[PDB]
Amino acid sequence: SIQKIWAREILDSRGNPTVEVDLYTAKGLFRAAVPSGASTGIYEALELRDGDKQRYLGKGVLKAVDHINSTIAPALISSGLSVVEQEKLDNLMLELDGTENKSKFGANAILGVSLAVCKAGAAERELPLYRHIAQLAGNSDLILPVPAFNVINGGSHAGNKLAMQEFMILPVGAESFRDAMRLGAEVYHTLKGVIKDKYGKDATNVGDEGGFAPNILENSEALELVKEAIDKAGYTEKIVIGMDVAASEFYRDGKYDLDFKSPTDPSRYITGDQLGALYQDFVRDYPVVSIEDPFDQDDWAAWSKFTANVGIQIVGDDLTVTNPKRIERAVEEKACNCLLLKVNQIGSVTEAIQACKLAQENGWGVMVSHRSGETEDTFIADLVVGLCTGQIKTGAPCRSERLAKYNQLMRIEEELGDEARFAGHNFRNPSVL
Amino acid sequence: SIQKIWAREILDSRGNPTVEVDLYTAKGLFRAAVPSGASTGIYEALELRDGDKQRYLGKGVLKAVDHINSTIAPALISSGLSVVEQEKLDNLMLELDGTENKSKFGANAILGVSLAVCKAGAAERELPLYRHIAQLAGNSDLILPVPAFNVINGGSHAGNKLAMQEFMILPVGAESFRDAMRLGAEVYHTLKGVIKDKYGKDATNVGDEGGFAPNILENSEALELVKEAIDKAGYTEKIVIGMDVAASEFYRDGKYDLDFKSPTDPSRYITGDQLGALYQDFVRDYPVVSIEDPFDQDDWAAWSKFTANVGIQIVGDDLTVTNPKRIERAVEEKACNCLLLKVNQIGSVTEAIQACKLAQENGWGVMVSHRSGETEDTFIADLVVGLCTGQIKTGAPCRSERLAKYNQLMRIEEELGDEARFAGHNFRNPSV
Numbered sequence: 001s002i003q004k005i006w007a008r009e010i011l012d013s014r015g016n017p018t019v020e021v022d023l024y025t026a027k028g029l030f031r032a033a034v035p036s037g038a039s040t041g042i043y044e045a046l047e048l049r050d051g052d053k054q055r056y057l058g059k060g061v062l063k064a065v066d067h068i069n070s071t072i073a074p075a076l077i078s079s080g081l082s083v084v085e086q087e088k089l090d091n092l093m094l095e096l097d098g099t100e101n102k103s104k105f106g107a108n109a110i111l112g113v114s115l116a117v118c119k120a121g122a123a124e125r126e127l128p129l130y131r132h133i134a135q136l137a138g139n140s141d142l143i144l145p146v147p148a149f150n151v152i153n154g155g156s157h158a159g160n161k162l163a164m165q166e167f168m169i170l171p172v173g174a175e176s177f178r179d180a181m182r183l184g185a186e187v188y189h190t191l192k193g194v195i196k197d198k199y200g201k202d203a204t205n206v207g208d209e210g211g212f213a214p215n216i217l218e219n220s221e222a223l224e225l226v227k228e229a230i231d232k233a234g235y236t237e238k239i240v241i242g243m244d245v246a247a248s249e250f251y252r253d254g255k256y257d258l259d260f261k262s263p264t265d266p267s268r269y270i271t272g273d274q275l276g277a278l279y280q281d282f283v284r285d286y287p288v289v290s291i292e293d294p295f296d297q298d299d300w301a302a303w304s305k306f307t308a309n310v311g312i313q314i315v316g317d318d319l320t321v322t323n324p325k326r327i328e329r330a331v332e333e334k335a336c337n338c339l340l341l342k343v344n345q346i347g348s349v350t351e352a353i354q355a356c357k358l359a360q361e362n363g364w365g366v367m368v369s370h371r372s373g374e375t376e377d378t379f380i381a382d383l384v385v386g387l388c389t390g391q392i393k394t395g396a397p398c399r400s401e402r403l404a405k406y407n408q409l410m411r412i413e414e415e416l417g418d419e420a421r422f423a424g425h426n427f428r429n430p431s432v433l
Numbered sequence: 434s435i436q437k438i439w440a441r442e443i444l445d446s447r448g449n450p451t452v453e454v455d456l457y458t459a460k461g462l463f464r465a466a467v468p469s470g471a472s473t474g475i476y477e478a479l480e481l482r483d484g485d486k487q488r489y490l491g492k493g494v495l496k497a498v499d500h501i502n503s504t505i506a507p508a509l510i511s512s513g514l515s516v517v518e519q520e521k522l523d524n525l526m527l528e529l530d531g532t533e534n535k536s537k538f539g540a541n542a543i544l545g546v547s548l549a550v551c552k553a554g555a556a557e558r559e560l561p562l563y564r565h566i567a568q569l570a571g572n573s574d575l576i577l578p579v580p581a582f583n584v585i586n587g588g589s590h591a592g593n594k595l596a597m598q599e600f601m602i603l604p605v606g607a608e609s610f611r612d613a614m615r616l617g618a619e620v621y622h623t624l625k626g627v628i629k630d631k632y633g634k635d636a637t638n639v640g641d642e643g644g645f646a647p648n649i650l651e652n653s654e655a656l657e658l659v660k661e662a663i664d665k666a667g668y669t670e671k672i673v674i675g676m677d678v679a680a681s682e683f684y685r686d687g688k689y690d691l692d693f694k695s696p697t698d699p700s701r702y703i704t705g706d707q708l709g710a711l712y713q714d715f716v717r718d719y720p721v722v723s724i725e726d727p728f729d730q731d732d733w734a735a736w737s738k739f740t741a742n743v744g745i746q747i748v749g750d751d752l753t754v755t756n757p758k759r760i761e762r763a764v765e766e767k768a769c770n771c772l773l774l775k776v777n778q779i780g781s782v783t784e785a786i787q788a789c790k791l792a793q794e795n796g797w798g799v800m801v802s803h804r805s806g807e808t809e810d811t812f813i814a815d816l817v818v819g820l821c822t823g824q825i826k827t828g829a830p831c832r833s834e835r836l837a838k839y840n841q842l843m844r845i846e847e848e849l850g851d852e853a854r855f856a857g858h859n860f861r862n863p864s865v
């Protein structure tokens with residue numbers, strides 16, 4: 001069982017405080033940290049910050065840390081449960097918080113412990129994390145996902161006009177995970193040259209997720225730059241494009257502002273229909289195979305309409321918030337066909353796995369995801385392999401809070417051997433391999 | 434002894450290949466990875482790259498990985514040496530490579546092994562890494578360093594015109610290491626605003642080390658921006674500035690080009706004398722307490738003359754390349770008074786610790802440093818504490834290949850409990 005739990009405040013990849021947990025068992029020390037979003041959906045579980053203006057501009061997480069150290073710790077220690085008992089230990093924390101959105105302790109408190117317990121449970125089972133996660137989820141046949149690399153950053157993640165948040169490349173045609181890394185990196189480096197040649201060296205600094213942040217406004221131009229880099233790198237047959245629009249960030253009184261980082265001017269706002277029409281142009285002009293949050297998190301009608309009119313992957317993020325309640329509604333309304341899985345949107349390992357299995361039982365894909373604010377933690381690498389989802393997005397191949405996950409996936413591939421299967425073109429539904 | 438060594442290619446913080454090593458002993462698995470510079474001194478130990486123009490644009494490290502898996506691993510394993518024997522194991526590597534500059538296996542191959550050996554050594558001693566390193570170095574005091582945060586990035590490779598490489602803030606007046614992290618992070622976020630209000634949001638994206646990359650040319654403007662943010666954040670009395678000029682990057686024809694990322698034009702060149710007068714202006718007008726690589730790695734006369742005429746810290750980086758032979762010369766010529774310690778400029782833990790002790794025995798400071806291409810490895814956090822140097826630069830408080838080290842230092846401070854001391858105002862000479 002659990003011997004000791006100790007939380008502390010560390011800094012995330014943007015320099016903001018976040019929760020880290022050390023959990024001790026007779027097998028040793030297990031450590032996890034909690035990521036943090038910037039474009040956070042209104043329905044996400046509560047991320048509890050201190051609000052002390054003279055400390056980290058109000059962003060401290062000492063209250064969450066104290067909840068773990070003073071309340072959650074003795075409760076789990078008192079339970080005497082084995083760390084393999086992920087569901088029972090998570091349920092104890094949810095019940096002890098007692099609120100629907102984890103607002104007593106914060107989702108960041110509960111999740112930090114939940115992650116560390118799962119790492120400790122793996123060790124107790126004497127299994128790599130990915131395999132323990134597979135067992136928790138009832139899977140046997142592990143798969144390496146296609147990585148989705150966010151190589152141009154916009155929206156709330158970069159200092160440019162570009163309103164859409166992420167432009168991703170997916171090496172579906174790679175021979176292996178390790179090969180997908182090579183394709184992704186090579187295109188990223190080629191892209192830096194494309195941008196520099198066109199816009200100058202000052203357009204080649206990076207946004208919060210490691211993607212370049214060129215000084216452009218038009219989303220189609222970001223698409224054109226990524227397509228050119230794929231082609232110049234020689235991978236047109238093998239790499240396709242995905243997007244995270246993050247439309248909730250630029251939703252304004254029922255309309256959408258594709259220039260939301262410039263001073264307010266409602267005369268430029270477009271309707272949901274016009275935005276849809278734009279995406280139709282993107283899908284026909286570029287190799288876009290996936291679009292995340294194309295509309296606002298409460299714009300259910302636009303989602304459903306759009307999803308019914310395309311053949312590509314449509315990904316719920318702010319829409320679904322890794323929350324079975326909202327997923328059920330989306331499935332009933334056919335609002336989308338893929339769940340973005342963010343453990344910190346719901347606040348526990350057990351509920352994230354439940355959310356994944358719910359989507360998968362309904363024919364949806366699932367893409368495991370980082371947050372904009374990450375840490376050196378690599379749990380989600382193991383998570384996407386154990387959940388067998390076939391897709392992960394965890395940054396450009398730049399900034400080590402992103403590479404740390406991609407390196408871990410390469411290590412997991414190596415460990416699995418000639419039993420490593422890569423999702424490739426089955427990234428939406430890899431259970432067929 | 435060592436049961437198995439297995440090296441692999443991973444990606445560093447810029448998305449370029451680098452060497453990782455997994456070493457197994459009865460105590461378990463010990464992993465380390467090797468960083469990589471961009472503004473690399475001509476005298477640095479050789480970083481071996483594959484140069485296959487078709488694969489990772491020539492930057493693969495399959496050769497170095499092969500050297501470790503095929504050549505080095507079986508030799509060290511056959512040796513039977515305990516992983517506690519850092520010196521013997523490094524020396525065996527040095528002799529197998531057989532070249533002064535590690536040009537046969539690559540310094541990246543030998544360091545990857547050397548670091549993993551060290552981590553495994555600590556575990557055999559049943560000590561935390563930082564304590565093992567202290568024992569290797571013969572140190573008993575420990576001290577948390579003042580962090581130097583690179584919050585405005587410039588130089589060879591900066592998506593701006595700014596010629597000088599790094600503008601750093603140092604929270605010398607902090608109450609602890611963890612307090613120094615809050616002061617740094619708050620000034621960083623204050624600086625983002627300062628920049629955004631003056632230059633617009635497009636100037637607030639980041640360079641390789643997580644510092645802002647504003648579209649400016651004048652080095653004094655970088656300093657003004659930094660000074661404003663310190664003051665706006667309310668920390669004028671507790672934070673000071675350090676600079677890495679990396680002047681070898683802009684040395685041209687016996688002179689210096691402060692606009693080197695612009696199309697060539699000799700007319701704009703200045704002499705080392707004009708450059709030194711610029712620095713004396715910076716020191717007088719800004720709270721600059723440390724300047725690294727103010728002159729070219731071969732311009733010994735400028736280094737010695739400037740060091741003799743200032744009371745600030747003068748740091749050799751490309752001048753000394755963590756190399757005891759170069760340090761000897763710099764000591765004799767009084768070229769600088771602080772060593773920048775980069776384990777990968779020399780290629781082994783043993784030799785880095787020898788370089789640090791040579792510097793310290795001659796009354797110099799030592800600043801442990803990252804490279805601009807880093808990994809999720811946090812070795813240098815344990816290093817700077819065990820060597821007791823009192824100062825570390827390992828990035829802005831942004832990008833987790835930087836934060837991973839700073840967060841490890843917070844952990845080490847927490848582990849030392851009541852026995853924790855912070856170098857603070859005594860960063861230059863914390864042995865007092």
Ligand SMILES: O=C(O)[C@@H](CO)OP(=O)(O)O
Nearest residue numbers: 037038039040370371372
């Ligand atoms: O909207 C998103 O998918 C995420 C992931 O990049 O960004 P954030 O963590 O800021 O919500």
Ligand SMILES: O=C(O)[C@@H](CO)OP(=O)(O)O
Nearest residue numbers: 470471472473803804805
């Ligand atoms: O010159 C330096 O001190 C370093 C700073 O991290 O840069 P690089 O590793 O590129 O040489």
Ligand SMILES: [Mg+2]
Nearest residue numbers: 037039040246
């Ligand atoms: Mg978001």
Ligand SMILES: [Mg+2]
Nearest residue numbers: 244246292317
């Ligand atoms: Mg999103």
Ligand SMILES: [Mg+2]
Nearest residue numbers: 470472473679
């Ligand atoms: Mg350099």
Ligand SMILES: [Mg+2]
Nearest residue numbers: 677679725750
């Ligand atoms: Mg330097």
